[PDB]
Amino acid sequence: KLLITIHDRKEFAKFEEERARAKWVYSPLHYSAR
């Protein structure tokens, strides 16, 4: 049996790192004036 300790670490790290450094966008349904 072979164990993986390189593809799982790089995929999870890139997911959570880009998750906190993402730009937020608001919808015009809640806000009336802009």
Partner: protein, 101 residues
């Protein structure tokens, strides 16, 4: 009832307990968003298009934020994040033109 003209996107979600991603199907329409299981081919949970407050689009991962409906947070890994963000924005523009106050 089953509607005609549905857009499906390939997205991955992480399971509770273990730190690993698994394949999942996501069906988006002009009225509501729903998640379909790849193994059973059935709907588990769905959300309304007008209940969404804000969303974040990244190169490899899409994020969603609900107001007074969901308790936790919905996060998935998408290959075409720019195409999904443009599709949701266009559906909101069509509703505002039909039902204007």
């Amino acid at each position: 009832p089953l509607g005609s003209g549905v857009s499906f996107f390939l997205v991955k979600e992480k399971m509770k307990g273990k730190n690993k991603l698994v394949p999942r199907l996501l069906g988006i329409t002009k009225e509501s968003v729903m998640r379909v299981d790849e193994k059973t081919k059935e709907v588990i949970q769905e959300w309304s298009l007008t209940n969404i407050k804000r969303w974040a689009a990244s190169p490899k991962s899409f994020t969603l934020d609900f107001g007074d409906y969901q308790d936790g947070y919905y996060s998935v890994q998408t290959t075409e994040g720019e195409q999904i963000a443009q599709l949701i924005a266009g559906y909101i523009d069509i509703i505002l033109k039909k039902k204007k106050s």
